[PDB]
């Protein structure tokens, strides 16, 4: 009964276009394919915008006011979005490829590099009510005879410097009256002019060329004219200038070369501040902060993004995404971290709160097919097509064990026992499930009985039974632990593609090739429910198709499914443009999500392969926090969450229940009534207001009297609220009072409080213990210093 919205895109920090810094300097805007990601450098957070282009973004820009963001794709279709409210304002089609877009520092105008033309437009007014046709064109300029590489605004918004592949830099006046002031073209460079910049006083102009030459232009007498007074050269052996940026206030010049290295220079002295290398791929985009202290670089080939603090030679941000599509994903048991794997063969560990990669593992030679955590959570296992299964200790970030078959079997699926003592893998070529001992690393035995390749495995987190399904049109339940081994095969109408264990361990759901999700009772081994999915799935006609989408049967089944931790929902995805969320007990579709709106991707709408990227979801999982689910796709890891919660969803509401009446009860000191009415309304602002208004002396009284029905919901509220709240002791007092008062009830119903307790344990472990760990170290460090004999 939750509404999920796309929140952020992990696994991709930069694909192409230009990166920009916020005017305050505290945020970085990076194009990620079709969408724009915003990184909070100070708060170490990140979000991705929900709006979406038809194609990949080419150029973006944010005005100095911080109110308007303009993004333009590769065919010239622009989207104007209110940056603060994150809502799209207008769409405009400039009908030409735009290389660069820049706001004037005044913000009234923005300039467009379109072919060999410079278009100046008037910026729409954000404050005003939404206009039907807001874009009015200011001026158009045509001097260049060849495409414009870049453009630069003057600090006073009165002049623009445009550089083109005509080996020329050209200056324009934004006011017609001042045309005589600046109507000059600067020649002299032997290659493409990549950047032209004003000095801070604007008396001097610096032009940079692709060949690696910097010219200093001054207005001087031989009666007065612009002349090259000084010439500097980057003596790169073969590297060419790829991107250049300048900061007039601090006179900093940052140049990124095609060899993958960048230099920082001081002008006009040309003093090389520093020289570093990001790799062997071209540096595509370079940006400078408003204060000039942070430098952002981006390489498109490997999708690297680097924020460099050259003052202290420190790294604010240093991230590289997956080169290939993410094949699998796995949440940490508490939901603090998510592990991803790629067809390349490298695993990356991500932190949910920050959205940045903590470690990358490159032990696997071939594509990693599955990653899974143990119930303990410190250990992670991965299976790969290279023929190995590896165990990773995520406290010390080390591959402490490798499992392999006798004959190098390609593993596609993986399952780990709840006790973390048995690991099982399956293959498309062997038909046998290999079992290893975690402690010893030796093959225990091979579970035989499937006639077809094994598609999917899972242990029950509680019962510890193993379910395996295959293209043999059957599912087998293995009771491997115990003195005797039993197997129970259940027949299914079609090949089984995906499989999921209900968190209770009493039912298993399978997705088949006929587009059916069938739920079976494990103990009785009989079907208990079924869901149709063919009609719900959305699949687009591929450009190469010679048959219609409606007649097409390419992918009308789900290749991956997962239970919600409540057990009442299943999220499903496949080789299609749909992620469907079904309600198991009612067998109805809750909601359908469109994965991409990129017209480039194939599924959105004779020796040589006609192969081009297509949209597909490789893995889905629910967050153990019960607020989000993540879907691994070609573009990256899409995370949908319920954080905003604008919905009004009251519970057991009555006429006498009102936000005013809740506040009245607080003023009357009726804390139990106020808290209950706040939950019945189910308004986050009101629950927070009542929650913090209850005095410490009254908490044990209120906690003891909470009705049982509201107990799971308040426990959920504290766990989610405490993780990011500053009131550590206040939230700890509340948890202790609830646990001490309703501990027996929670024990009687573990499944009902499974997600609430897990969120609480995340807070007590990931923040509360770490605070105490610092405080206790100072206690013992202090005792040693004072109690001990000092040196002579």
């Amino acid at each position: 009964k939750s509404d999920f919205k796309f929140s952020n895109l992990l696994g991709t920090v930069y694909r192409q276009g230009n990166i920009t810094f916020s005017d305050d300097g505290k945020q970085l805007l990076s194009p990620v394919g079709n969408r724009v990601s915003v990184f909070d450098l100070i708060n170490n957070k990140s979000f991705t915008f929900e709006y979406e282009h038809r194609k990949n973004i080419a150029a973006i820009d944010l005005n100095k006011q911080g109110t308007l963001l303009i993004s333009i794709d590769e065919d010239g279709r622009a989207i104007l979005v209110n940056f603060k409210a994150r809502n799209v304002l207008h769409h405009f089609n400039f009908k030409e490829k735009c290389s660069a877009v820049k706001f004037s520092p005044d913000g009234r105008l923005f300039a467009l590099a379109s072919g060999r033309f410079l278009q100046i437009w008037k910026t729409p007014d954000v404050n005003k009510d939404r206009q039907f046709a807001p874009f009015v064109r200011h001026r158009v300029h045509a001097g260049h005879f060849q495409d414009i590489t870049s453009l630069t605004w003057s600090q006073d918004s009165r002049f623009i410097l445009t550089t083109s592949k005509d080996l020329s830099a050209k200056i324009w006046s934004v006011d017609s009256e001042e045309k005589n002031l600046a109507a000059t073209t600067f020649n002299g460079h032997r290659d493409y002019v990549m950047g032209a910049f004003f000095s801070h006083d604007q008396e001097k102009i610096y032009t940079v060329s692709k060949d690696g030459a910097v010219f200093v232009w001054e207005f001087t007498k031989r009666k007065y004219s612009w002349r090259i007074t000084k010439k500097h050269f980057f003596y790169a052996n073969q590297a060419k200038v790829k991107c250049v940026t300048f900061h007039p206030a601090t006179r900093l010049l940052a140049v990124g070369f095609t060899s993958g290295e960048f230099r920082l220079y001081d002008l006009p002295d040309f003093t090389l501040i520093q020289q570093l290398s990001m790799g062997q791929n071209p540096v595509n985009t370079v940006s400078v902060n408003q204060t000039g202290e942070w430098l952002a670089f981006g390489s498109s080939k490997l999708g690297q993004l680097l924020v460099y603090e050259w003052q202290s030679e420190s790294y604010i941000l240093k991230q590289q995404g997956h080169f290939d599509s993410t094949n699998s994903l796995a949440y940490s048991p508490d939901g603090s971290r998510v592990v991803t794997a790629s067809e390349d063969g490298k695993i990356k560990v991500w932190d949910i709160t920050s959205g940045f990669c903590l470690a990358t593992f490159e032990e696997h030679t071939s594509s990693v097919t599955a990653v899974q955590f143990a119930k303990r959570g410190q250990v992670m296992f991965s299976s790969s097509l290279d023929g190995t299964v590896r165990a990773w200790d995520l406290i010390r970030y080390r591959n402490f064990r490798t499992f392999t078959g006798t004959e190098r079997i390609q593993f596609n699926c993986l399952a780990v026992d709840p006790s973390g003592e048995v690991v099982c893998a399956g293959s498309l070529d062997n038909f046998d499930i290999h079992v290893w001992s975690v402690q010893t690393g030796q093959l225990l035995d091979a579970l035989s009985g499937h006639e077809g390749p094994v598609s999917c495995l899972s242990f029950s987190q509680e019962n510890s039974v193993l379910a395996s399904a295959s293209w043999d049109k059957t599912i087998r339940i293995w009771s491997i632990f115990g003195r005797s081994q039993q197997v129970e095969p259940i027949e299914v109408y079609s090949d089984v593609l995906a499989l999921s264990m209900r968190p209770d361990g009493k039912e298993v759901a399978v997705s088949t090739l006929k587009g059916q999700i069938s739920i079976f009772n494990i103990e009785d081994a009989k079907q208990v429910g079924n869901i149709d999915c063919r009609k719900d799935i959305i699949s687009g006609r591929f450009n190469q198709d010679r048959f219609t989408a409606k007649n097409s049967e390419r992918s009308k089944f789900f290749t991956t499914i997962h239970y919600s931790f409540d057990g009442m929902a299943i999220v499903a995805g496949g080789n299609n443009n749909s992620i469907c969320l079904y309600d198991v007990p009612n067998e109805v579709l809750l909601k359908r999500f469109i994965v991409s709106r990129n017209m480039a991707l194939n599924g959105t709408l004779l020796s040589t392969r006609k192969m081009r990227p297509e949209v597909r979801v490789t893995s889905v999982q629910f967050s153990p926090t019960a607020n989000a689910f993540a879907a691994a796709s070609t573009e990256g890891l899409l995370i949908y969450s319920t954080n905003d919660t604008i919905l009004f969803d009251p519970f057991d509401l009555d006429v006498d229940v009102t936000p005013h009446s809740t506040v009245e009860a607080l003023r009357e000191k009726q804390f139990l009534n106020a808290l209950v009415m706040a939950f019945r309304l189910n308004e986050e602002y009101l629950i927070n207001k009542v929650y913090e208004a209850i005095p410490i002396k009254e908490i044990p009284l209120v906690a003891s009297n909470i009705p049982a029905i509201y107990l799971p919901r308040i426990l959920k509220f504290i766990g989610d609220f405490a993780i990011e709240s500053q009131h550590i002791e206040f939230n700890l007092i509340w948890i202790k009072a609830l646990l001490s008062a309703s501990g027996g009830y929670i024990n009687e119903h573990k499944y009902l409080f499974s997600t609430a307790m897990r969120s609480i344990q995340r807070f007590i472990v990931r923040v509360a213990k770490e605070v105490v760990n610092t405080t206790t170290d100072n206690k013992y460090t202090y005792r040693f210093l004072v109690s001990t004999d000092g040196s002579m």
Partner: protein, 98 residues
């Protein structure tokens, strides 16, 4: 974080050790406010890392000894947090398990 670390290292470490004593008095005031508790504890951790030997060598000095003793009086009070954390882990682990 870079700025904080540089300043703490740069505190003068020569007798009469005025700055180090001043910093301890500053941090002792911060703990009394019961605000920004995790940073003040972290600052004191960085003080011992960078100037522990100076403090250890001259622990008998009245100014350093008194400033640390005042810090202990406040820091001793802030041990009730450990009791809450230990209680909740003990019961949360037991309740969810058995």
């Amino acid at each position: 974080p870079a700025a904080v670390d540089l300043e703490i290292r740069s505190l003068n470490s020569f007798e009469p050790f005025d700055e180090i004593v001043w910093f301890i008095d500053a941090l002792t005031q911060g703990l009394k406010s019961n605000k920004n508790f995790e940073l003040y504890e972290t600052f004191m951790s960085l003080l011992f890392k960078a100037h522990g030997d100076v403090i250890h060598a001259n622990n008998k000095n009245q100014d350093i000894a008194s400033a640390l003793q005042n810090w202990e009086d406040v820091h001793k009070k802030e041990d009730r947090l450990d009791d809450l954390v230990k209680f909740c882990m003990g019961v949360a682990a037991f309740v969810t398990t058995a």
